[PDB]
């Protein structure tokens, strides 16, 4: 009864029609809702919110004062009563306006489920936003990705797992500098994360496990080596083998390959 009654204003004082046809339409929609039409239920509640906003405006008061919530209670009342997801009605309407002592209280006295409050927290401001996301907690910056890399098992996998995903190559070199990283491993990460897209992808076919569970060994470099040399691109290997494992002979065995088949002297 309260829902149908409150639906009057922004269906009659906003639309021009005979009230009887409106009544018939509303009755049809009501019987439809009785059938548990979730979509129709959502539409009906949406209209309820719209008309409620109109009515709130009509009373000529602040759109988010105390009596505002007093009239707004029915908004939660309906949604809960009909077993529909608690709609984010006035939480946002206060969120954009930077008024915390409404997003605290009115968050509270209806039991706003903890996912929604945090999820909608990202509307306030620069300030009173960091004091709030951390308030009840319970990357893309090299000064951060490495600052928060003192937390893993040791290190030798968080940095590599984070750097294989986003194509970067000034992280792997730091990765193979902390105490306990397999020097013959990070080479796979560099040479696979400093090439083009298709080259970086089609070479990955040798892998079987997922991204964070594929500890490299002295075997994956084999397919990496072969894939890189096929479809000519050698100034990358002839380049990595200097940062990593040094003048050891494989470097020269590949250094021949620049003076021949590319440079021809």
């Amino acid at each position: 009864m309260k829902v149908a009654n409150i639906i009057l204003s922004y269906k009659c004082r906003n639309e021009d029609a005979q009230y009887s046809f409106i009544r018939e339409s509303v009755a049809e929609k009501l019987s439809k809702l009785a059938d548990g039409e979730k979509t129709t239920t959502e539409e009906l509640l949406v209209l309820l919110e719209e008309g409620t906003w109109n009515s709130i405006q009509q009373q000529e008061i602040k759109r988010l004062s105390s009596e505002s919530s007093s009239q707004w209670a029915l908004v939660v009342q309906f949604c809960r009563l009909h077993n529909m997801k608690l709609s984010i009605s006035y939480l946002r309407e206060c969120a954009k306006a930077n008024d915390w002592l409404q997003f605290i209280i009115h968050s509270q006295l209806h039991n706003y489920h903890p996912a929604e409050v945090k999820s909608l927290i990202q509307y306030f401001s620069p300030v009173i936003q960091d004091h709030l996301r951390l308030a009840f907690e319970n990357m893309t910056d090299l000064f951060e990705i490495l600052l928060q890399c003192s937390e893993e098992p040791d290190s030798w996998h968080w940095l590599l797992v984070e750097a294989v995903k986003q194509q970067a190559p000034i992280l792997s070199v730091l990765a193979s500098c902390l105490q306990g990283a397999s020097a013959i491993s990070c080479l796979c990460v560099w040479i696979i994360t400093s090439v083009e897209d298709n080259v970086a992808t089609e070479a990955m076919g040798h892998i079987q496990d997922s991204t964070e569970d594929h500890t490299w060994n002295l075997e994956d470099l084999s397919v990496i080596w072969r894939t890189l040399l096929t479809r000519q691109k050698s100034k990358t290997l002839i380049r990595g083998f200097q940062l990593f494992f040094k003048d050891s002979p494989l470097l020269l065995v590949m250094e021949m390959y620049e003076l021949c088949m590319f440079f021809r002297n």
């Binding site: 007093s70 209280i105 509270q108 910056d141 000064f143 600052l147 003192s150 070199v173 897209d197």
Partner: protein
């Protein structure tokens, strides 16, 4: 009860919870109390950050016990519970947010015995990083006691991540402005190639904590005066395989001096660590 509070079809279609004997006046009293509280609440709370907290901490303890904000704080903290459902676990949001503007005030005041925690909703004026920055640099605090205290409250300000991004550098690592800039560089250099080949015929003391934790995040921190160069010298000397991708990356952009006295201070040292991953890479 309706008539007395004021002092059929009028009523049996309103929407209080149930028409039981008490619930009507119960809700009336609860709503009226919450409103009469929150009104005076906003009134009081509508009334320098560190300076203001310092001053509020200089009064007498009996005076501080009567903080108007605190005075109504427990009133509302209890009204919310007394006006709410029963049997369902009400997550005490007001408590959680009161703790974070109480405990942080306490720590940021103590690090500056005991302390009279006055009006605590005065530090919500500025953001998180700003406060730690002000305390760390301005009022001569040592960047170890603070990182010690914040440990024993279960917080996450990250006393290193607030000192690095206030005096060091804007190093950024995107991933989509690389494949959208290779196809731009390949064109701009080509246009600059044809039209030129067709011519064919104090200086910080937080280095203490910085070096204390994870020396790598001290080397990269340095690379972002002559004393700074001197620190970089040794701190990179202890690292063999990093100064190879900083000298096979410094020649084909500028060329004397030393391998560190040239970079650490110039915009030659922020397009070189990262590759094409920079806003100012192209120029």
């Amino acid at each position: 009860y309706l008539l007395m509070s004021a002092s059929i079809t009028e009523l049996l279609q309103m929407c209080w919870p149930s028409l039981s004997e008490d619930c009507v006046a119960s809700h009336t009293t609860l709503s009226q109390q919450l409103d009469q509280v929150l009104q005076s609440l906003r009134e009081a709370l509508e009334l320098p950050p560190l300076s203001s907290l310092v001053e509020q901490a200089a009064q007498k303890a009996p005076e501080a016990e009567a903080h108007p904000v605190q005075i109504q704080t427990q009133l509302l903290q209890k009204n919310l519970g007394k006006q709410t459902p029963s049997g369902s676990r009400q997550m005490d949001y007001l408590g959680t947010f009161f703790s974070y503007c109480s405990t942080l005030a306490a720590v940021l005041l103590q690090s500056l015995v005991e302390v009279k925690v006055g009006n605590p909703f005065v530090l919500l004026q500025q953001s998180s990083s700003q406060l730690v920055s002000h305390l760390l640099f301005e009022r001569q605090v040592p960047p170890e006691r603070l990182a010690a205290l914040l440990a024993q409250e279960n917080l996450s300000l990250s006393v290193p991540q607030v000192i690095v991004s206030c005096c060091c550098e804007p190093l950024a690592l995107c991933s989509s402005r690389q494949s959208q800039q290779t196809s731009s560089l390949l064109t701009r250099l080509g246009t600059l190639a044809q039209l030129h080949a067709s011519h064919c015929l104090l200086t910080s003391s937080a280095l203490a904590f910085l070096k204390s934790r994870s020396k790598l995040l001290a080397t990269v921190a340095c690379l972002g005066a002559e004393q700074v160069a001197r620190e970089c010298e040794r701190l990179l000397e202890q690292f063999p395989l990093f100064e190879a991708f900083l000298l096979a990356a410094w020649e084909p952009l500028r060329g004397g001096q030393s391998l560190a006295v040239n970079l650490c201070g110039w915009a030659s040292l922020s397009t070189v660590l990262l590759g094409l991953h920079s806003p100012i890479a192209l120029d």
